[PDB]
Design a protein around this ligand. Sequence first.
Ligand SMILES: Oc1cccc(-c2c(Cl)cccc2Cl)c1O
Ligand SMILES: Oc1cccc(-c2c(Cl)cccc2Cl)c1O
Ligand SMILES: Oc1cccc(-c2c(Cl)cccc2Cl)c1O
Ligand SMILES: Oc1cccc(-c2c(Cl)cccc2Cl)c1O
Ligand SMILES: Oc1cccc(-c2c(Cl)cccc2Cl)c1O
Ligand SMILES: Oc1cccc(-c2c(Cl)cccc2Cl)c1O
Ligand SMILES: Oc1cccc(-c2c(Cl)cccc2Cl)c1O
Ligand SMILES: Oc1cccc(-c2c(Cl)cccc2Cl)c1O
Ligand SMILES: Oc1cccc(-c2c(Cl)cccc2Cl)c1O
Ligand SMILES: Oc1cccc(-c2c(Cl)cccc2Cl)c1O
Ligand SMILES: Oc1cccc(-c2c(Cl)cccc2Cl)c1O
Ligand SMILES: Oc1cccc(-c2c(Cl)cccc2Cl)c1O
Ligand SMILES: [Fe+2]
Ligand SMILES: [Fe+2]
Ligand SMILES: [Fe+2]
Ligand SMILES: [Fe+2]
Ligand SMILES: [Fe+2]
Ligand SMILES: [Fe+2]
Ligand SMILES: [Fe+2]
Ligand SMILES: [Fe+2]
Ligand SMILES: [Fe+2]
Ligand SMILES: [Fe+2]
Ligand SMILES: [Fe+2]
Ligand SMILES: [Fe+2]
Lengths: 287, 287, 287, 287, 287, 287
Amino acid sequence: SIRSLGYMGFAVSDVAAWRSFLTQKLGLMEAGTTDNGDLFRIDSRAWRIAVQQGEVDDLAFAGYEVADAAGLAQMADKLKQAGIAVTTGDASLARRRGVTGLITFADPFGLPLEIYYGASEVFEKPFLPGAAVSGFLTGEQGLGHFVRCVPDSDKALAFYTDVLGFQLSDVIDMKMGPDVTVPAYFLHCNERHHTLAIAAFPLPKRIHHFMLEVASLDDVGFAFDRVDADGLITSTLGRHTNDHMVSFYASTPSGVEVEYGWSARTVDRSWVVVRHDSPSMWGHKSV
Amino acid sequence: SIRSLGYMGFAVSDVAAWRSFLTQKLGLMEAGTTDNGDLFRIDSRAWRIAVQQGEVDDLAFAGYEVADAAGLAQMADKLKQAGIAVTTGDASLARRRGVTGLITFADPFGLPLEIYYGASEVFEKPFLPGAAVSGFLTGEQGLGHFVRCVPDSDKALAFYTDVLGFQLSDVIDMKMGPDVTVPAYFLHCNERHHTLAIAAFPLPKRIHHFMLEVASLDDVGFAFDRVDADGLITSTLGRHTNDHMVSFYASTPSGVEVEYGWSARTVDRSWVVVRHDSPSMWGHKSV
Amino acid sequence: SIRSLGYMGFAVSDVAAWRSFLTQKLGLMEAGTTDNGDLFRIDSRAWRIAVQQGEVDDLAFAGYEVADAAGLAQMADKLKQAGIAVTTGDASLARRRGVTGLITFADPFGLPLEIYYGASEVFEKPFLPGAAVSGFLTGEQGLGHFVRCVPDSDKALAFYTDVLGFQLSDVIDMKMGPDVTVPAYFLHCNERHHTLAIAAFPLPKRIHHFMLEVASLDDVGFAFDRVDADGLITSTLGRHTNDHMVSFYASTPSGVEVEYGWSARTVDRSWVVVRHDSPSMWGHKSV
Amino acid sequence: SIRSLGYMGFAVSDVAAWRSFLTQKLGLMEAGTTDNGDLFRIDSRAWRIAVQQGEVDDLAFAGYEVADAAGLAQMADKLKQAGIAVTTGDASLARRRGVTGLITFADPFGLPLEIYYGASEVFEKPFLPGAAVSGFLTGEQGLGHFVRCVPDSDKALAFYTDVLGFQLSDVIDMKMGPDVTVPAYFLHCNERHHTLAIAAFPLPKRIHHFMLEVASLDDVGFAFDRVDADGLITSTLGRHTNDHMVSFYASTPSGVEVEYGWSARTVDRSWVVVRHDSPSMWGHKSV
Amino acid sequence: SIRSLGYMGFAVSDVAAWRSFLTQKLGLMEAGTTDNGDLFRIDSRAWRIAVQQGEVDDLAFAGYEVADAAGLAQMADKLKQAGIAVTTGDASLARRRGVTGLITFADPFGLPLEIYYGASEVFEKPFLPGAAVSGFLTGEQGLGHFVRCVPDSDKALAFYTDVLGFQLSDVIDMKMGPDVTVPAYFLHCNERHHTLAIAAFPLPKRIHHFMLEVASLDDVGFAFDRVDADGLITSTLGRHTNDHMVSFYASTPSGVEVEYGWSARTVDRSWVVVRHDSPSMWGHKSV
Amino acid sequence: SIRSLGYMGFAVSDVAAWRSFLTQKLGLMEAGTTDNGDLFRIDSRAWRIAVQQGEVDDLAFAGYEVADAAGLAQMADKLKQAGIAVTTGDASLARRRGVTGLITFADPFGLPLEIYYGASEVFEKPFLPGAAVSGFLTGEQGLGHFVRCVPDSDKALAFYTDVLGFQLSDVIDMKMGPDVTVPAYFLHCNERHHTLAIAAFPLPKRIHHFMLEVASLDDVGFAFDRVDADGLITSTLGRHTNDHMVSFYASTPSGVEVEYGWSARTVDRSWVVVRHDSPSMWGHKSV
Ligand SMILES: Oc1cccc(-c2c(Cl)cccc2Cl)c1O
Ligand SMILES: Oc1cccc(-c2c(Cl)cccc2Cl)c1O
Ligand SMILES: Oc1cccc(-c2c(Cl)cccc2Cl)c1O
Ligand SMILES: Oc1cccc(-c2c(Cl)cccc2Cl)c1O
Ligand SMILES: Oc1cccc(-c2c(Cl)cccc2Cl)c1O
Ligand SMILES: Oc1cccc(-c2c(Cl)cccc2Cl)c1O
Ligand SMILES: Oc1cccc(-c2c(Cl)cccc2Cl)c1O
Ligand SMILES: Oc1cccc(-c2c(Cl)cccc2Cl)c1O
Ligand SMILES: Oc1cccc(-c2c(Cl)cccc2Cl)c1O
Ligand SMILES: Oc1cccc(-c2c(Cl)cccc2Cl)c1O
Ligand SMILES: Oc1cccc(-c2c(Cl)cccc2Cl)c1O
Ligand SMILES: Oc1cccc(-c2c(Cl)cccc2Cl)c1O
Ligand SMILES: [Fe+2]
Ligand SMILES: [Fe+2]
Ligand SMILES: [Fe+2]
Ligand SMILES: [Fe+2]
Ligand SMILES: [Fe+2]
Ligand SMILES: [Fe+2]
Ligand SMILES: [Fe+2]
Ligand SMILES: [Fe+2]
Ligand SMILES: [Fe+2]
Ligand SMILES: [Fe+2]
Ligand SMILES: [Fe+2]
Ligand SMILES: [Fe+2]
């Protein structure tokens, strides 16, 4: 089974702008440039986010991590049983991603996805943030989460749940006007409240935002100010109703947003599905 | 010696507005009306804040608490030795304040002050906040703090330090324009980083603001939204450089502000005086 | 200085009734009979309560403990300096009490008092309660407390405070009718909120009650039922406003009451004197 | 299933040198001499390491522990199902090893292996180290680990994983020259990050080294100096990238090395396989 | 002021017997032989017990530790003010003891005493017990205690209390026959319940026993058996009424006894003097 | 009284080399350049180490921190009473150092010293290390320590102890050849085992080394490798006998060494002076 979101790749029009934003604003660590593009770290892994030159200015691909080779084989079988076109990543791609093995495919709406095992650790190159950040929260919870924008949430939900094995945490019926209410589904694959959210929003991108979690409230507070200095804040500090994460949102150079948060609650086998009519307990005022 | 700030009285033009603000917005508990005015609670004490009808729309008086009768006598002696006009509170005033004994006087610039002992507890009338607040932080740290605006900080500092016994925590040189920088002094009389601050600000009131501390970040977050709904926020959420309190500021019906915060650090006998050039680590953006 | 209340002696008309009450109802341990009367234990000390045959049916004497011989000498000097008639306990009395040294005198209203040092421990005779009690709370807090009924509280307060060194914790103005309100003073000599209380009640005894503290709520609950079975309960379970002790009151065979409680808060050097208008937060309904 | 590495036997040319090295340098306890050779302890077990006279100067055999007789029977069946020649240890061998029951066989490359249950405890002969060592870490993690040098890692990996049940922790691609890179596989059978490692190194011995873990950093520091005094250090202090153990390496009298470490992290069912390009975060400089 | 008992020296007729007893039976560490005699350790200090050849077969001297040079000077002054003959230890003696400075004198009954500061630490020679002992308890509590046998306890008590500054913990009236009861005084100079005890016992030695405290119950249990094997036990395992130490007693080769214990309670400034009629809660049966 | 070592200034011939060494090797944060020279941080303080252009290639000055203005006045008085030439730092110097007030003078051998109060905090510019360091340990323990090389240790000791108020922790008699042994004195002014050490070493500099303490063992391990890469290590990893700090030593561009450590023990009022014959328990091999 999939254990977590392991990495993400972005294809952007302004690579230099993304380099500055990720390091100076968010505090990620520059980790070199390879055939995989500019690499960025948040922990012991060789890379978590890759930035390549591209006109889409959007998420180019996402990689989900399994525990081992057997886990990869099981997922490949499940995908093919579901009629999904699966391709074994050649040695060249595995090297580019720095993984031992991987398979590639796309979700129902074209997002390139990868499932891999045996990623590269670089403890000998101790993580040093590009900005003052006490630390990022990863471990068994993986990289964080992102919100997949789709045309049909039911079809997307069925794929991620029935085929990829994600489990529902909760639903938030997002009010988008007196005559518009869209359900947002939050799914987990580990203790992180959600690793993936699905919603039918009127956005021209594959995702609304990706989220990175930090170790302290000050990490969030300082980052907010660094981002605000450039007028990139899209939402004030607030706490979510479902995962109870305290965060703010900001614009990346590609328009896609990034959520930066702290203190979210986790889920387990005793968790029960619930619904909400608001996404924020307090704060998160649109600006 | 003075152990803490015990209570405050305000003389306001719109008593009903203050009643609604303190209870519905800040979460204080209405505790009846007596010859002491409308009373409000935040803990086991019979009252901490009193609101009376008055045209000044400002702090009318403040009461500092001593441990016992002997403590009151010592302070009265110290004040008279300093040439300050001290008056023993008559039985009528003691009853009004609900204290066992007290003395009255004024600081160098006219603020009526009182030092008392033996205030009234009402554990049999369990505290119930007027809004969703997990709790206020008082105990040995007292009510909170307020910032006394004065024409001459040196004279004020000498009185509060040499006569009343407050001790300096730190100084912040507040930038108020390319050609204006004013020092703000933060003083303690217990573990609370500061119970009183002194500064020469261009304000027509006795104090810039008073501060109340709550038990959780959510208490602050929810209150921010309740206040923001009425457009009364004066500063966004932020954390101070000196006491490390996370708070926001808002306007009371009298114009004087109120600071609502959480998680401040405390001080002790190992504390050393320092200086700062900024009052906020992050946040506290003027709005 | 006096460190705690160490023991109490009662002169009663029905010794057998007291023996049964203390052991079967309250859970004290029978510890033999000597020239000191019937002895009862609650901890490692050879005895804490003595019961002798007497028509007064009241507290016959109370012993306060000092840390050592030097402490005893200091107290004897303080008492004589105050004009109090002090008598050195002869070897015979010291043996009877099982102490190394002691002095005797009376308070302003005739209560025989003793100050001693070097009491006897009997760890080799492990404490075994006479009823199901997980344990009594003593240690540095001593035996517990009792309430001295006096004709003039001011005179009594001055003696116990100025001469014996007790310190005021708080005051409760006890309502005893639309036209009657009497102040009750609670005094400490260690961490126990109060070891002695003073009040001018209309009672024909030296004390209103003595109090013993137990280790768990169940100890109190079970004892309540054992006492209630004989119709001796005088007050339902409740919690006090000042020491926050959860307790109930009952009648001893002498009429004097006994308070049996659990979970009281303690005091220290940061404590400030306060006042109350009620003695109970909840419960303690007279029955 | 195999629960841990339980013991090891070495056949050496200089038994006296090994006796001195194990006790004076590493701190093991001499535990007598039997038909099993010279015995050495590190905990409550009668012996963990045996040293016999032999010209190979290498690991002579290794014993893996199962929980009980049923566990032994299951492993014997699994081995025979795999076509491995298994022999039931006769009463004579069981006595020599001090175990209740055992089976013997060899791995694909000739290393004599044993699986047993019911080893002997000697709590009545309290462990006393031969040198200043606060303690060795064993318990459910067993003796420690050793690195099996093989000609074909794939064949070895398949045997230890598919037949013996070891699970992969991670892989480190060891750089051994611009044109030489060999993968080292680390396998676990309990919480210890690895109980066995497999690699195709150019060494004329069955193992590169065996490892013993101690309770404190000082245990390692002092041992380093005792070994360094004789010029036997082969690697400076360092911390591994995979198990995060802080250790140093040294030469035994047989040339085979020994690793002595502290503070390694453990693994569980939430562990995911990863890869590394370096075996040390810091230190471990070859000397 | 004296901070603890730092070391002891014994003059014995059978040095080899003492060497074996201290190391093999009690677990002390042999620490070389100098002009100070055979040295033995129990912790980081270069030595705590010295054994020299002598016909007295008794304690030859004891050294009390002060915090620094100023402390030594103060004690020397106090002793001379009391009329005691004090001698400054020459450089030769200081070297022999491995201390920076010391003064020598005798107690009222001839026991040679020394007060010193700046003893030698040997952390570079890590403590290794001569037998299986998890550790000895020293630190701020010093070496342990010993019981000084005297002809006149009152005179001895006055010297150790009034001159050396020891403080009384408690008294035990030791029953030694229907017509014989002797008081034993236990004195502290730090947190250890007692560092010195004084009693008028009918023994031909300077001390009844010296005591060493270990870290676990097993340390005591195993030692008991090692001593019992040679028939040297003088008292079964038991727990004391005053310090609550669990221990046993045994005969040294000189006849003087040694107490070996674990888990004693400590004392502080809140401690009150008490008396006992038995020295043991349970156990300590004479054999 | 002096509370800690607050800052140090170095006058060096190669400012760029020092900039690279402090940031890239040790992990300090570049904090701008002012009339005070190049500034470097390790915590919330505006600066802790300053580097100015100078031919001495040595410590140029050191600043000791007092708690407040009163503390500064007391020290100035003590110094003048001792006949030391004290100069009040003018507003220009105070600004350069970023302190509220300070006095200047020199120790007996020419080292310029300063005592100040009210240094500048910059929490709004969150500390970001120049290399991977989890954190530096400062707080109430100050910057760290340095070893003052002097011609006459007795004279130096008397000044720092009798005049500046430092207290002795311990002494280590450093072996420097069969015929050379020099005592090194370690002094504290707070909980840090030593803030200053004094010794008569044959070095042409004012100090042998200065020391910085980090939060984890890995911080030390990684730094060791960064320094070793340039062949600047002067001592292998080891742990000291007196403060039990685990550290290594390296050469700065000025020749003066720097010690980088972790996990030292602290001292308090229960500490007793001792002596040592070795400075290291293990490690610290000269290379
Ligand atoms: O906040 C956002 C999150 C995801 C996509 C867009 C976006 C929109 Cl709504 C229109 C044009 C281009 C972009 Cl990147 C966006 O503004
Ligand atoms: O992490 C989250 C938890 C709950 C809701 C949102 C959310 C919001 Cl607040 C706005 C748009 C889209 C989403 Cl998924 C979210 O990002
Ligand atoms: O934020 C504030 C704090 C204290 C006083 C005033 C004030 C001013 Cl600045 C002008 C007129 C009236 C008032 Cl209440 C104010 O606006
Ligand atoms: O509690 C506080 C700590 C530090 C600074 C201020 C402050 C600010 Cl942020 C603006 C105006 C006046 C003050 Cl005292 C403050 O209120
Ligand atoms: O509850 C009580 C506490 C103390 C004394 C009496 C008492 C009274 Cl109020 C009258 C006669 C006899 C007694 Cl013991 C009593 O009833
Ligand atoms: O322990 C106590 C704390 C507060 C009040 C009383 C009290 C009551 Cl509840 C009734 C009569 C007398 C007293 Cl002292 C009391 O016994
Ligand atoms: O460090 C080592 C680990 C295992 C084996 C050898 C070895 C070699 Cl590489 C050659 C000859 C003999 C030996 Cl023991 C060795 O030196
Ligand atoms: O315990 C370990 C963890 C990671 C790597 C090695 C290793 C090294 Cl550092 C050199 C040679 C062989 C091995 Cl297995 C190792 O012994
Ligand atoms: O247990 C003992 C403690 C101290 C001294 C002696 C002793 C006696 Cl009681 C007589 C002769 C010799 C000795 Cl050592 C002893 O037997
Ligand atoms: O440590 C101790 C605590 C209480 C009593 C004794 C004692 C005994 Cl049990 C017998 C003889 C002498 C002594 Cl001091 C003792 O050694
Ligand atoms: O390790 C050292 C610490 C302090 C000073 C020097 C030094 C020496 Cl010993 C000679 C010339 C120049 C220097 Cl910096 C040095 O080498
Ligand atoms: O922090 C320390 C503790 C004990 C000793 C030294 C030291 C050493 Cl190891 C060599 C030269 C000088 C000193 Cl002060 C030291 O720097
Ligand atoms: Fe999100
Ligand atoms: Fe789930
Ligand atoms: Fe404030
Ligand atoms: Fe203070
Ligand atoms: Fe009571
Ligand atoms: Fe008190
Ligand atoms: Fe290894
Ligand atoms: Fe596993
Ligand atoms: Fe003893
Ligand atoms: Fe004491
Ligand atoms: Fe140092
Ligand atoms: Fe000190």
